[PDB]
Design a protein around this ligand. Sequence first.
Ligand code: HEM
Ligand code: HEM
Ligand SMILES: Nc1ccc2ccc(CNCCCc3cccc(F)c3)cc2n1
Ligand SMILES: Nc1ccc2ccc(CNCCCc3cccc(F)c3)cc2n1
Ligand SMILES: C[C@H](O)[C@H](O)[C@H]1CNc2nc(N)[nH]c(=O)c2N1
Ligand SMILES: C[C@H](O)[C@H](O)[C@H]1CNc2nc(N)[nH]c(=O)c2N1
Ligand SMILES: [Zn+2]
Lengths: 411, 407
Amino acid sequence: RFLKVKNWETDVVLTDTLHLKSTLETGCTEHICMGSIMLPVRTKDQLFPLAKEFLDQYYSSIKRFGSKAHMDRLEEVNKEIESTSTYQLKDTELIYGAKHAWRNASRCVGRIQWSKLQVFDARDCTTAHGMFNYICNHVKYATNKGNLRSAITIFPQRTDGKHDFRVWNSQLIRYAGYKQPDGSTLGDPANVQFTEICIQQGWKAPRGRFDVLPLLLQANGNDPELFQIPPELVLEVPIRHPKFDWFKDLGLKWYGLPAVSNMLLEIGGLEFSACPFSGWYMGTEIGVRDYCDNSRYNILEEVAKKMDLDMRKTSSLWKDQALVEINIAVLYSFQSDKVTIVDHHSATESFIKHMENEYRCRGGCPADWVWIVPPMSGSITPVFHQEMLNYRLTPSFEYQPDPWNTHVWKG
Amino acid sequence: RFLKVKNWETDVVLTDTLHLKSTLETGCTEHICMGSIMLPTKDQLFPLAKEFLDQYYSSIKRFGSKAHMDRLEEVNKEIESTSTYQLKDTELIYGAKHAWRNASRCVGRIQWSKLQVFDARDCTTAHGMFNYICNHVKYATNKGNLRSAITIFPQRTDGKHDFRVWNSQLIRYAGYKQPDGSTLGDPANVQFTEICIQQGWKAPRGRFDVLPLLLQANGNDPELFQIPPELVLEVPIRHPKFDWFKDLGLKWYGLPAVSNMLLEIGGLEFSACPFSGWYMGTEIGVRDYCDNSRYNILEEVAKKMDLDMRKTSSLWKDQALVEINIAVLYSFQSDKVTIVDHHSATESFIKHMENEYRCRGGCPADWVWIVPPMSGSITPVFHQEMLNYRLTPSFEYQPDPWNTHVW
Ligand code: HEM
Ligand code: HEM
Ligand SMILES: Nc1ccc2ccc(CNCCCc3cccc(F)c3)cc2n1
Ligand SMILES: Nc1ccc2ccc(CNCCCc3cccc(F)c3)cc2n1
Ligand SMILES: C[C@H](O)[C@H](O)[C@H]1CNc2nc(N)[nH]c(=O)c2N1
Ligand SMILES: C[C@H](O)[C@H](O)[C@H]1CNc2nc(N)[nH]c(=O)c2N1
Ligand SMILES: [Zn+2]
């Protein structure tokens, strides 16, 4: 079965056959579309097909499918499964795995870059202190003084689900949130709960608007420990506007390195529950969502006030106006300080080119429209006009529940 | 089976059961989501009628009454004998309103029950269709104080006798591709425009020429008709602060009136059923003006504002887009023609979603269409999970009639 997608600005029609290799389910049926729903221990039993399929893919990419080296690896993984009940990836398969999970990430607009991923293998790590060391190295390497480099650090895989490695932070670098007695929040509202756990674990909170959180790190199923990232390692950019001089006086900054740490990487049936990865920001993640979501820093009003917009009717589009300025400021600031960032026009255009190349070479590109279209100026980006097919390939990145909801405390 | 939708900005959770009534299909499966694809007999007819009538009698709190049973009996007799049936006025009105209520792509549905229904099932000729249409336009326009309405022509019979309005909207601007190679007017209608010309229309060949109606009755060849200009309320587009804006020469019409859809009620198909409400500003300022394949004017507007067009990162496109949309809303408001802005339309739809969850057990919504085409995440619909499913009565698309009809 061949599936066509049309771009309605260009009349370019593409044909998907890759969706035919899709295993996992979507959430949808013939009767309901769940395309906007945010979130919709294995036995040997289920493991060997997952391994086989994975190594068939790997061995095809390298043009060795059916080789003696292909067959010997299958038999060797097989034996290891029935013997030890799990198995170890070779270096090369890990690398190829981590790249493919990014490549298959249907919600990621930055995938044109999937083949440039620095993989750090931390599978020999045993302790939280060891994890900190690995994470500091990742953060320094990826930062690279502003010339950001994509990277992933991969800690040991799940075994019995009782010995899990986790990074409890949702991103390696992120700001604290503090709910005040009056009901206001200080700093980032999205991180209040996490901030509270850190405080409980003994972090002494500076309690400012932009306090970088400590790392809370779990090794081998043990209780997590607190660590401070060395500040010299945390690159930050003060936000100013190219024409509005009062902009800097809002006191805003952001960090340069987006590094997601709470996802689960699946490769050939193996589950890597600590696999923090980092790329660089599209400006709208900060300027639209982090600053302007109502449940985040919510600076829209204060910016519009300062701009002396007519705020008495929404039909003045004062919000739309304030939002573009804030986004201009974010990009100006990053570029001025030579920190890598991509605006949303440039990122979405790149993604269309990636997507077409992917249809030409791979037979498809799973893509989640709801996520790929930027959260401002939707129809002036070419992705808005692109039809997309959403489906799940492995290897993949998956969500997992927050560890504080599942962890068995040792004490 | 009882599904949850969460609003991530407010944490409000709503439980959908109304989806279990879904009859039609989505295009999606367990393996592939098609959420962003634009377009994914006697025996047949009786279940359809039955299902519709059961919901009609339930809505008037008469489920299982003699009157309910008798109508089922009566429609059933009419199907078996005539192989079709007729709706009572009351059922017609209920069906049309419900087709709107169930339109999962429509943000404006808080309004669904104030819909003026004009019954034109007694119509027999294009001239008649023209008269009905003019009456609809004038009623709906209401001198700028716009009122929702639909006009319903006779239902399909053997599909050789269809009533069609060939226009996509009752009011739209012409499209002429050039020797010079570009496009004068609205490039979306270039083809319809030549069908008109190659059917007789004398085109003024302007940028904003109201198209002539091309109406088809009883499956006949269709006929041209100019809408009396006096019935076409148009708004000249100016900016509340940029004086030069007025000199771009932009105008838009006040009445959005989709005329190419098919209205399905109780298995009955109404292939000509033009309906109209009023504009959300973004439809004109974002889509009509700025789509690359539409009037595509962002380039010219950015110049006039003297923005740095050297690089995409100055967000000059975004700046100009906002000002264009400020201007649309300003013009319509100044001229007292009804329009709604995207903030206000989406806030209304969230409240409508609330009402429908508590009163009906949910509300089909297509997130991809409902989220406006600018400033997505600063409107509350962005943060609202929605379930999309197909209920009947419904509006459906249908082939452009020039691909179907025979001369
Ligand atoms: C290199 C520069 C990159 C850019 C500009 C980029 C862009 C983005 C953006 C804008 C999103 C949506 C984020 C949100 O709204 O929450 C996203 C999602 C995603 N990205 Fe990328 N990305 C980049 C690199 C990467 C890398 C290196 C990986 C993994 C190796 C990755 C994997 C994903 C995944 C798994 C999601 C889904 C997040 C979720 O479902 O919560 N990204 N990316
Ligand atoms: C009262 C003022 C109204 C507002 C502000 C409104 C808003 C909208 C908007 C913004 C769209 C997306 C249009 C597009 O992007 O092409 C839409 C689609 C739709 N609306 Fe409404 N609407 C209103 C009245 C109505 C009425 C009176 C009906 C029918 C009785 C209706 C039925 C639909 C249908 C069927 C669609 C989508 C059709 C498709 O799938 O292409 N609308 N509406
Ligand atoms: N520039 C980049 C690169 C990769 C990224 C990967 C993930 C994210 C952030 N994802 C956060 C998702 C938070 C969330 C909340 C609720 C539900 C849900 F599914 C996700 C940002 C990136 N930004
Ligand atoms: N204010 C309103 C109210 C109701 C409306 C109903 C329909 C439309 C227009 N829909 C046109 C979509 C055209 C199209 C082309 C190609 C594929 C496809 F799915 C739709 C605008 C409205 N605008
Ligand atoms: C309910 C809805 O799916 C939710 O708001 C999504 C919409 N699209 C998104 N797109 C991106 N990139 N990131 C997000 O957090 C969201 N949130
Ligand atoms: C590819 C995508 O399905 C297509 O561009 C859609 C996106 N969302 C839309 N939303 C609305 N309201 N109207 C549209 O025409 C479209 N076009
Ligand atoms: Zn779907």
